[PDB]
Amino acid sequence: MKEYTLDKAHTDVCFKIKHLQISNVKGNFKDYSAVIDFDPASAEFKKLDVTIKIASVNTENQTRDNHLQQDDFFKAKKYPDMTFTMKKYEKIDNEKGKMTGTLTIAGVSKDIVLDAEIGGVAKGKDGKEKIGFSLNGKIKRSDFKFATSTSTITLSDDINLNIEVEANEKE
Amino acid sequence: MKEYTLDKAHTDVCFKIKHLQISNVKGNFKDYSAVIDFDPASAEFKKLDVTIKIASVNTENQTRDNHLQQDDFFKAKKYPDMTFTMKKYEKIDNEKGKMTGTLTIAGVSKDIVLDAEIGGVAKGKDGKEKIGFSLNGKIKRSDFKFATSTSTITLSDDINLNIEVEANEKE
Amino acid sequence: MKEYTLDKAHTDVCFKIKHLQISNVKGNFKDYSAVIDFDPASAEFKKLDVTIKIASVNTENQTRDNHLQQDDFFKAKKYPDMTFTMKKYEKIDNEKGKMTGTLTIAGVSKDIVLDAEIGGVAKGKDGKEKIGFSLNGKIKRSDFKFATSTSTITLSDDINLNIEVEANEKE
Amino acid sequence: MKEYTLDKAHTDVCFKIKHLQISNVKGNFKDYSAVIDFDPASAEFKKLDVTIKIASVNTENQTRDNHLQQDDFFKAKKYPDMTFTMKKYEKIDNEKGKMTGTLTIAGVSKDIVLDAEIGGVAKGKDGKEKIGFSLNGKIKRSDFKFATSTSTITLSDDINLNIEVEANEKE
């Protein structure tokens, strides 16, 4: 034989190990329209109608937003927009209510509950009305047969919705 | 009632969805010693003995390297170093061999196989010997009861070892 | 050389592949007490106070129910029971309400919302009162620092509560 | 108000919690052919050629074996069989060797290493030759672009091969 001594500068004692990490994908939508009927005297919504153009999805990532439009997700060619239609608003108090409505994603429709939290009915700058309010709720991908190819392991079945609204009076 | 029109600048149609991502944790060890007996005439290792000071782990992350020393991992107080001892080298050809040896991690010992790939026996700068060679192999955390508290879901049971060596002759 | 022909009866072309499966752990509790104050004239709960003896957990598995009592879960020696105390009941209609209360698990307390669904106020067999009702809600393990050693990957952060009640009048 | 006492027989304090479980999918193949050239005097394989009919997959599950034939897996219509062809056998000793060969799965081909473990060269019942031997190795789904739609989270990238052989002499 023969003996050797390491050269520490060009020797590497290395390892690789695979691990999972859970993370939140958080996105908004840049382009959407709404019809808002709300009566500050009773603090009750009367009509809430929302259309969101899928094309406008923004999850802080160019390449994933594209992939969202594809057939294993939104199918944006065939179904260009998702829609919400209020069917019922059930008042809890002047700050809180349970909003039921029809959500449609990729041409499939389920009724959902959103938690309305009225964040302040004012009469703003110019003496015309403003209102803040939030809508919050969880929906299940499985309920809308969304991304059915993607397992509920890889991507959660649960989608948390957070709609934050400021809104001004008509004309 | 009363009608409102969104202010798009202070309205946000948001969602959150939890997903998993797989990733490789890749680290080395800054401080280790070796005894290397190798016979270039037969290209056979005769003795390979390695001690790696756990304290010197570097996985490009200060806070995780600490956490590696803790009791749910390396137990570096009680077991300050991990060791490899060659028991057998089985030659495939002049470039390749199957090295069997005892690995000890946190005072538990299993025999492993590493794949020796001899990357060039030269006689360098000053007319003294050098050798390159790699040792590659997979070990199972479960075999050494490592991180037993961490599931094989979160962190893989499989650890890939890659030892890259340059090494010079004695005295 | 020499040629051979398989014996198919004692030859096996085999493979192993690791995959994940998501599943629901569903359990009840065999031993618990409650104080129920409810006014059928207004269909409003007035007091709801529940203590559940952790020892009585039943998730259709002997060995896991034990493991639930251990320190990486319930700590049943130190904290023998978990408790719910109603602080608020907010009526939606005669069938529905939003119940807020303090939940304590292993000596940690958070206020929760349960969805009360009144399933029928009758006057039963003997002319004494009965009531059906359900309480439903989701709580987060992280909110109560529960099983903190177990990742939110392996076991979901989300716990769905379903309390199904039948209940009779006093004395 | 009014007070109620639970009826424990028709009251249920329930919970649901989602958790992951890792498990091994283990299958064989019922229908396959082989050409085996082996020289007991030198204990070296000379030729090893295997074709496995995908249709014959058996993973102890009727409905999954079907699903294996589909386009997100084996594509059994277009690619009815997978094949192994030995290109090299490198002897370690009389019991052990490193077999290199071309594996093809769904019309994609990679060279693999299997670990040959010769389990006994005998001359059996009738004075004609038999041989036992195993071939063992890991292959990566990603190397063969297999099940590319299924993530390496849900189903492991790693496939362990275990070929157990008994085999008799010609004619």
From TrEMBL, chains A, B, C, D:
Gene3D superfamilies: Lipid/polyisoprenoid-binding, YceI-like. Pfam families: YceI. Keywords: Signal. Residues 3-168 form the Lipid/polyisoprenoid-binding YceI-like domain. It comes from the Bacteria. The keyword rRNA-binding does not apply. SUPFAM superfamilies: YceI-like (SSF101874). This is Periplasmic protein.
